[PDB]
Amino acid sequence: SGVLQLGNIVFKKERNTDQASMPDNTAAQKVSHLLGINVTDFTRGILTP
Amino acid sequence: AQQAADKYLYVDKNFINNPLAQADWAAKKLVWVPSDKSGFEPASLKEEVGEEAIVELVENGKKVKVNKDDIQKMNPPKFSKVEDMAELTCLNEASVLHNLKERYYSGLIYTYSGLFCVVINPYKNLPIYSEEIVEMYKGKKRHEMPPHIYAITDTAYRSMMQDREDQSILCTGESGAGKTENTKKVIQYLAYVASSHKSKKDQGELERQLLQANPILEAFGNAKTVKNDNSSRFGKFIRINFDVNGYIVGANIETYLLEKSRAIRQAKEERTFHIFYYLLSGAGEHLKTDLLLEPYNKYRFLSNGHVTIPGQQDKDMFQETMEAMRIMGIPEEEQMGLLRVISGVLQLGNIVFKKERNTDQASMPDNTAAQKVSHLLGINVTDFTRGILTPRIKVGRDYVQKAQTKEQADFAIEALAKATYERMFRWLVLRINKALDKTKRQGASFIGILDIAGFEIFDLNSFEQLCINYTNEKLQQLFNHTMFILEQEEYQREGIEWNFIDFGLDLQPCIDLIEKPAGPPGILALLDEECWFPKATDKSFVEKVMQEQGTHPKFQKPKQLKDKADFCIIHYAGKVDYKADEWLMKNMDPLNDNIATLLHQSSDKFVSELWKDVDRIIGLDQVKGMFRTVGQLYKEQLAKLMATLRNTNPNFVRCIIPNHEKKAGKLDPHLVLDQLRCNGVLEGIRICRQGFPNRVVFQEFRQRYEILTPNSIPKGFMDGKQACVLMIKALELDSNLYRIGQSKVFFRAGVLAHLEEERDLKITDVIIGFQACCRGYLARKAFAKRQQQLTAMKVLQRNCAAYLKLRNWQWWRLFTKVKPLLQVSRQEEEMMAKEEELVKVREKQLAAENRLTEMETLQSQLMAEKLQLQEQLQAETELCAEAEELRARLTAKKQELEEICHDLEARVEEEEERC
Amino acid sequence: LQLQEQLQAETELCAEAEELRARLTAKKQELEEICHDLEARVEEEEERC
Ligand SMILES: Nc1ncnc2c1ncn2[C@@H]1O[C@H](COP(=O)(O)OP(=O)(O)O)[C@@H](O)[C@H]1O
Ligand SMILES: [Mg+2]
């Protein structure tokens, strides 16, 4: 289920910069719940490693 | 100190509620007006028409004409001693000066200014620093406690843990402002708090060494200048490394711009590095005999003799320096190596050259100074003299040798003294790093702590002060960029309908004047490409700077007389004039290769270690990529620093010297107002009040403050932005207090502090409820114990006592006598003894089996760990053997390349001869 | 503990050997660059004459 919730994650290209934004983290929350992780740490590690 | 706090820390902030404090000012119409008194003026306002005003002076009763643009509103007395100028209603220069001045004269030195703090130097040992860490500033977030360097340090530490982002704490003022002392207090606070939470490893030895690293580098390095009795003379950047728990795993210390020249010359009323004077002042007569120490009056290098500083004895500080070095664990052979090299640098100051009658080439009239040098540094007088007086160089096809005039020999002796002390200091920094950087792997996070040399003003300014002042300029530009530009760029990036505000405060024009390598070449980069020509001379450097940069708006034709070899430049804090005496030699810093290799090849291991990596040293005296100029070295190391700082959250601490007299209590209000203007303090507070200084990511905002609005969010998963919108509507925040970006919630000043207060209230209520349940459950246990202790014995004791009374009285006493006769009781006793001893051996059997099994698993695991360590040891040894093979191959091919290069030069010569 | 300290020693010696080879390769490159410069300029002089 966690692998299914990965890739429901949608990134949007920022309107003024060449950087990823995740304008809705619901799928990332579900992923973090299933995989056993903190949403915010996962979001940082993906968007800006 | 907690009892003293009412004078030195706390304020009756409730006075801000006072209505009459407003109504009295609203009656008096009190205003600020500017003045030439070396004071700033309060007044009441009485006439106006057009642009004109007239005011009555409150202290004088005099009345004077004033301009409408010169009046500044006094905040009503209601605000007096406000802890944070961002909280002021009428923000202006006179109100900030008034608040800082009256807080300082009252003894309160720290004040907040929005996202940064201001400090004014007390020039007293105020009771402000000892007790405060134990309770008062431990974890108490910014609004809980009055402004203090401990609150800054705690705020940075908490932000580092909460935000998972590396911090820096940056102290910025001219000399005597407080950067060094506040840096110490930061390190003391971090050491104390990070050791305190090690509930099984508190008061640890690394936190013991950290407190010593500063006194050592201050004993070396620092000096009594005109402006400061403990002048830095070097910049430093400490990094304290933390684990994921927030405990210290390491520290690192970088150093910059060490003023080598301080060892060789000083102004009329100044001192060398302290350690010279500590060592000469009564260290011990046996040490003096061993180290060949002599009275101060004999050395060239101790200008104007036994200069002293108040309040401290050099004799005691020598011992304290040795104590600190021992706590740092510098072995006594290395400590004595330092003392020997210090004495050797002084003894180079004893060398002199004869002023020869026959021709300009000269020799020493006395070898004894060179003998003392040989006995201290380990380089024999014959090779020392042959090297310095008659150096020989190898250049391609040929060897070249020259004579040395007395000036050239003195310049070689000075260069050796400067470079010897520099190398010793750099080694001592490396030793302290090696002692502190105990973990071979870096921490999960760090806090950087920057302490650059303060802005320098003298009548004698030179290249040293130019580089120091350039560093101060670039740090002030970091402040300006962070507070004004990156702040507003964050609003634009996050889409928050902000309209850009221009504050002025761009220093890139002057920074480019010094540092720019291309386009118009900047002063530092220009001389970097003029020291190489044989026609080069500092007077020509001045003329070329006047041609290439004399048109720059920040450059100035010399203040006093234009005809001398001077630069003059305009900087944020001051306009400064610098003399191009020996800048050719100072920027290139050449060394005699022969004497430098003789120092490397010394019989003394310590001097040979200081002079490791000599191979890079310069090949010629006073006339490219192999060498690097001091200008390039500073620019590169400073760029590495700035690139580090830009990758951290900066916590600025603006340090203000109240007066040039080093006097306690006195302010020069114009000197403070000048510092406030150049530092950008009021612009920094204006951007705090006008902008949205606090930002929280939607998910972090929910996770932290949902406790305030627990029924507002449905229990499912929901987008952080929608959850935040729901929370903020449930918090009923006024729509001007917050804005919602693309990833962050933006809040005005104080709003998020109010939410933190609400959160601490909620968490306190939750803890009180849990304590109530805990204390109830403890009462349940107490009641159960009382129930057992009463109700059983009320029956059991009455029973046993009644039978004790009856059974001895009644014929059952006969059964007591028959029981010793009965054999069955003996057989039961024997069976019980058998069973008991069996049980003892059975317990030992089972325990021994468990112990054997567990220990055998430990033994097996240690066997596996042994095997792994042996395998990696084999890998390392085989890689050493392969590196040795590569070394042999490389050295052979290098010999071939050398011989071919010499054959090519021989061909060039033969071709030119045959032509 | 013996194997640990042996590993510390051999890693220290390996690091020193790597750093020494870095010095050797740097000096070799500088030498070869000056040798190639002299080769090129002697060929230029041979073309001039
Ligand atoms: N916070 C302080 N507490 C006590 N004394 C101070 C404090 N700040 C400065 N001083 C006094 O003023 C001197 C100059 O400040 P210092 O920090 O040494 O200069 P700088 O900021 O240029 O490094 C100190 O050596 C000390 O005597
Ligand atoms: Mg200082």
Distance in angstroms (rounded) separating the CA atoms of residues B277 and B316: 12
Residue pair B623/B533 in contact (Cβ under 8 Å)? The answer is: yes
Chain B residues within 8 A of C24 when measuring between CB atoms: 887, 890-891, 894
Question: Is B454 labeled as catalytic in the residue annotation?
Answer: yes
Tell me, using a 6 A CB cutoff, whether residue B335 lines ligand 1. Answer: no
Q: Report the largest interatomic distance among the alpha carbons of chain C, rounded to a whole angstrom.
A: 71
Distance in angstroms (rounded) separating the CA atoms of residues B74 and B25: 8
Q: How far is the CA of B103 from the centre of ligand 1 (A)?
A: 18
Cβ-in-10-Å burial (0-12, 13-18, 19+) of B847 comes to exposed
CA angle B16, B18, B24 (to 5 degrees): 110
Distance in angstroms (rounded) separating the CA atoms of residues B593 and B612: 13
| Secondary structure class of B399 (helix, strand, coil) | strand
Distance in angstroms (rounded) separating the CA atoms of residues B632 and B431: 25
Q: Which of B104, B117, B214, B230 has the most ligand 1 atoms within 8 A of CB, as the residue to mutate?
A: B230
Question: Is B246 labeled as catalytic in the residue annotation?
Answer: no
CA C42 vs CA B530, B899, B908, C35, C45: distances in Å: 29, 16, 6, 10, 5
Neighbours of B155 (CB within 10 A): 18
**B876–C27 CB contact, under 8 Å:** no
**A40–B697 CB contact, under 8 Å:** yes
Residue pair B578/B465 in contact (Cβ under 8 Å)? The answer is: yes
Distance in angstroms (rounded) separating the CA atoms of residues B296 and B307: 10
Bin B823: left if φ > 0, else alpha if -120 < ψ < 50, else beta. alpha
Q: Among B98, B102, B105, which residue's Cα sits nearest to residue B72?
A: B98
Distance in angstroms (rounded) separating the CA atoms of residues B406 and B416: 15
Tell me, using a 6 A CB cutoff, whether residue B121 lines ligand 1. Answer: yes
Annotated catalytic residue within B95, B113, B232, B241: B232
> Rg of chain A over CA atoms, in angstroms?
11
Compare all CA atoms of chain B with the CA of C20 and give the residue at the minimum distance: B887
- Three-state SS sequence of B771-825: HHHHHHHHHHHHHHHHHHHHHHHHHHHHHHHHHHHHHHHCCHHHHHHHHHHCHHH
Neighbours of B887 (CB within 10 A): 15
Chain C residues within 8 A of B883 when measuring between CB atoms: 14, 17-18, 21
* Partners of residue B656 on adjacent β-strands: B120
Q: Touching check for A29 and chain B: CB below 8 Å?
A: yes
> Rg of chain C over CA atoms, in angstroms?
21
H or E element, residue B394: strand B392-395
Q: How far is the CA of B125 from the centre of ligand 1 (A)?
A: 10
State the sign of the Cα–Cα–Cα–Cα dihedral B184, B190, B196, B202.
Answer: negative
CB contact burial B434-449 (16+ within 10 A = b; e otherwise): ebbbeeeeebbbbbbb
Strand order of the β-sheet with B41-49 is B63-67, B52-57, B41-49, B30-33, B72-73
Cβ-in-10-Å burial (0-12, 13-18, 19+) of B830 comes to exposed
| Secondary structure class of B13 (helix, strand, coil) | helix
State the sign of the Cα–Cα–Cα–Cα dihedral B140, B142, B146, B150.
Answer: positive
CA B626 vs CA B175, C26, C27, C39: distances in Å: 36, 10, 10, 20
**A44–B703 CB contact, under 8 Å:** no
CA B304 vs CA B263, B271, B296, B384: distances in Å: 13, 9, 9, 29
Q: Among B427, B415, B432, which residue's Cα sits nearest to residue B622?
A: B415
B31 is written with which tokens? 């205003």
Question: Is B891 labeled as catalytic in the residue annotation?
Answer: no
Chain B residues within 8 A of A10 when measuring between CB atoms: none
B664 is written with which tokens? 């306690």
Q: What is the DSSP letter of B175?
A: T
Task: Name the amino acid, one letter, at B778.
Answer: L
Alpha-carbon distance B440 to nearest alpha carbon in chain C (angstroms): 11
Alpha-carbon distance B416 to nearest alpha carbon in chain A (angstroms): 48
Tell me phi and psi for residue B552, to 5 degrees: -65, 140
Which of the ligands is closest to the CA of residue B312?
1
> Given B877, B901, B907, which is nearest C31 (Cβ)?
B901
Distance in angstroms (rounded) separating the CA atoms of residues B86 and B91: 8
Tell me, using a 6 A CB cutoff, whether residue B225 lines ligand 1. Answer: no
Question: Is B358 labeled as catalytic in the residue annotation?
Answer: no
Alpha-carbon distance B241 to nearest alpha carbon in chain A (angstroms): 20
Alpha-carbon distance B749 to nearest alpha carbon in chain A (angstroms): 25
Cβ-in-10-Å burial (0-12, 13-18, 19+) of B844 comes to exposed
Q: Touching check for C36 and chain B: CB below 8 Å?
A: no
Annotated catalytic residue within B121, B222, B231, B594: B231
Residue pair B652/B448 in contact (Cβ under 8 Å)? The answer is: no
B230 is written with which tokens? 């403990």
Which residues have C-beta within 8 Å of that of residue B295, sequence separation ≥ 6?
A: none
Which residues have C-beta within 8 Å of that of residue B133, sequence separation ≥ 6?
A: B150, B188, B189, B192, B193
Alpha-carbon distance B705 to nearest alpha carbon in chain A (angstroms): 15
Distance in angstroms (rounded) separating the CA atoms of residues B25 and B512: 48
Question: Is B374 labeled as catalytic in the residue annotation?
Answer: no
Q: Among B77, B138, B147, which residue's Cα sits nearest to residue B113?
A: B147
Distance in angstroms (rounded) separating the CA atoms of residues B473 and B638: 12
Nearest-atom index, ligand 1, CA of B185: 1
H or E element, residue B850: helix B823-914
Resolution given for this structure, in angstroms: 3.0
Q: Touching check for A33 and chain B: CB below 8 Å?
A: yes
**Given the DSSP bridges, would you call strands B117-120 and B110-112 parallel, antiparallel or unpaired?**
antiparallel
Which DSSP string corresponds to B499-567?
Answer: ---------HHHHHHHH--SSSPPHHHHHHTTTTSTT--HHHHHHHHHHHTTTSTTB-S-SS-TTSSEE
| Secondary structure class of B107 (helix, strand, coil) | coil
Q: What number of H helices and E strands is found in chain A?
A: 3, 2
Question: Is B750 labeled as catalytic in the residue annotation?
Answer: no
Residue pair B195/B204 in contact (Cβ under 8 Å)? The answer is: yes
Alpha-carbon distance A30 to nearest alpha carbon in chain B (angstroms): 7
Distance in angstroms (rounded) separating the CA atoms of residues B105 and B118: 15
B344 annotated ligand binder:
no
Annotated catalytic residue within B113, B228, B594, B602: B228
B174 annotated ligand binder:
yes
Nearest CA to ligand 1 atom 10: B123
| Secondary structure class of B653 (helix, strand, coil) | strand
Q: How far is the CA of B582 from the centre of ligand 2 (A)?
A: 26
Tell me phi and psi for residue B46, to 5 degrees: -130, -20
Q: What is the DSSP letter of B453?
A: P
Annotated catalytic residue within B172, B180, B183, B629: B180
Q: Which chains touch A (3 or more CB pairs under 8 A)?
A: B
**Given the DSSP bridges, would you call strands A12-13 and B30-33 parallel, antiparallel or unpaired?**
unpaired
B640 annotated ligand binder:
no
Beta strands in B700-767 (DSSP E): 738-740, 744-747
Annotated catalytic residue within B114, B176, B250, B448: B176
Compare all CA atoms of chain B with the CA of C49 and give the residue at the minimum distance: B915
Compare all CA atoms of chain B with the CA of C39 and give the residue at the minimum distance: B904
Residue pair B100/B111 in contact (Cβ under 8 Å)? The answer is: yes
Tell me phi and psi for residue B253, to 5 degrees: -135, 115
Residue pair A8/A27 in contact (Cβ under 8 Å)? The answer is: yes
B665 annotated ligand binder:
no
- Long-range contacts of the stretch B282-285 (C-beta < 8 A, 24+): B282/B314, B282/B315, B282/B318, B283/B315, B283/B318
**C31–B898 CB contact, under 8 Å:** yes
Task: Name the amino acid, one letter, at B731.
Answer: L
Question: Is B231 labeled as catalytic in the residue annotation?
Answer: yes
Residue pair B637/B515 in contact (Cβ under 8 Å)? The answer is: no
Which DSSP string corresponds to B274-342?
Answer: HHHHHHHTTS-HHHHHHHT---GGG-SSSTTS----TT--HHHHHHHHHHHHHHTT--HHHHHHHHHHH
CA B236 vs CA B222, B426, B429, B566: distances in Å: 12, 12, 10, 29
Q: Among B561, B559, B565, which residue's Cα sits nearest to residue B540?
A: B565
Which residues have C-beta within 8 Å of that of residue B55, sequence separation ≥ 6?
A: B31, B33, B43, B44, B45, B46, B63, B64, B66, B71
**Given the DSSP bridges, would you call strands B117-120 and B649-656 parallel, antiparallel or unpaired?**
parallel
Q: Touching check for A37 and chain B: CB below 8 Å?
A: no
Distance in angstroms (rounded) separating the CA atoms of residues B271 and B281: 14
Distance in angstroms (rounded) separating the CA atoms of residues B170 and B448: 8
B403 is written with which tokens? 């004579």
Size of interface A-B (CB pairs under 8 A): 31
| Secondary structure class of B884 (helix, strand, coil) | helix
B61 annotated ligand binder:
no
Compare all CA atoms of chain C with the CA of B905 and give the residue at the minimum distance: C38
Residue pair B372/B292 in contact (Cβ under 8 Å)? The answer is: yes
Q: Touching check for B496 and chain A: CB below 8 Å?
A: no
Chain B residues within 8 A of C34 when measuring between CB atoms: 901
Question: Is B706 labeled as catalytic in the residue annotation?
Answer: no
Chain B residues within 8 A of A23 when measuring between CB atoms: 721, 742
**Given the DSSP bridges, would you call strands B41-49 and B30-33 parallel, antiparallel or unpaired?**
antiparallel
Q: How far is the CA of B231 from the centre of ligand 2 (A)?
A: 5
H or E element, residue B655: strand B649-656
Compare all CA atoms of chain C with the CA of B897 and give the residue at the minimum distance: C32
Size of interface B-C (CB pairs under 8 A): 70
Residue pair B633/B616 in contact (Cβ under 8 Å)? The answer is: no
Q: Among B558, B572, B354, B408, which residue's Cα sits nearest to residue B478?
A: B572
Neighbours of B57 (CB within 10 A): 15
B176 annotated ligand binder:
yes
